[PDB]
Amino acid sequence: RSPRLVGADMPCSGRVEVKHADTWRSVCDSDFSLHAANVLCRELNCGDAISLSVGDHFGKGNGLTWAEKFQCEGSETHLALCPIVQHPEDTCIHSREVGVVCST
C-alpha cells in the first residue's frame, strides 16, 4: 500500500497512486476523504493536505483503480494502517482519478 504522487510540477502535489503487490492503482475521487489525503501527505514527508483535486487534474493514470477505499481516521502514519472498505457500486473511470496538493 505504498503511496506516490505523480504528475505534478513538484513532488508534493499530483495524482494519487498506491501500490498493491507489484501493481500501482489510482483512486477514484468518489472514494478519497480529506483524512486519507492527510495521511498520504504525512507518509510522503509533504506536510499536511491542502486540497484534494477532482477530475484527473494532474492527468489520468492508467491500469488498475482501487476497488476498496482507505477510510483513514486522520492520524495514521501510513495508508497501510487505515482500515479499508468497498468502493460504492459500479466502477469509476480514470477520468475521475483523484489528486492532492500538500502544503510545504
Numbering used by the authors: -1 to 0, 795 to 896
Sentences from the paper on this structure:
Infection by its etiological agent, PRRS virus (PRRSV), shows a highly restricted tropism of host cells and has been demonstrated to be mediated by an essential scavenger receptor (SR) CD163. CD163 fifth SR cysteine-rich domain (SRCR5) is further proven to play a crucial role during viral infection. In the current study, we prepared recombinant monkey CD163 (moCD163) SRCR5 and human CD163-like homolog (hCD163L1) SRCR8, and determined their crystal structures. After comparison with the previously reported crystal structure of porcine CD163 (pCD163) SRCR5, these structures showed almost identical structural folds but significantly different surface electrostatic potentials.
Additionally, a significantly reduced permissiveness to PRRSV-2, particularly HP-PRRSV, was shown in the PAMs with pCD163 SRCR5 substitution by homologous hCD163L1 SRCR8. MoCD163 SRCR5 was comprised of two antiparallel β-sheets (β1-4, β7 and β5-6) and three helices (a single α-helix α2 and two 310-helices α1, α3), whereas hCD163L1 SRCR8 contained two antiparallel β-sheets (β1-4, β7 and β5-6) and two helices (a single α-helix α1 and a 310-helix α2). A close comparison of moCD163 SRCR5 or hCD163L1 SRCR8 with pCD163 SRCR5 revealed that they shared almost identical structural folds (RMSD = 0.355 Å for 79 matching Cα atoms between moCD163 SRCR5 and pCD163 SRCR5, RMSD = 0.249 Å for 95 matching Cα atoms between hCD163L1 SRCR8 and pCD163 SRCR5). In addition to minor differences in the long loop region, hCD163L1 SRCR8 contained a shorter β4 (Ile842-Ser845) than that of pCD163 SRCR5 (Thr522-Leu527). In contrast, hCD163L1 SRCR8 showed a significantly different surface electrostatic potential from the other two proteins. There were more positively and negatively charged regions in hCD163L1 SRCR8 due to different amino acid contents. Especially, certain regions with the opposed charge were clearly observed, where the acidic residues were replaced by the basic ones. Based on the comparison, we hypothesize that the difference in the surface electrostatic potentials between hCD163L1 SRCR8 and pCD163 SRCR5 may result in reduced cell permissiveness to PRRSV-2 infection, rather than their structural folds. Furthermore, this comparison suggested that the surface electrostatic potential might lead to different cell susceptibility to PRRSV infection between pCD163 and hCD163L1, where pCD163 SRCR5 substitution by homologous hCD163L1 SRCR8 showed a significantly reduced permissiveness to PRRSV-2.
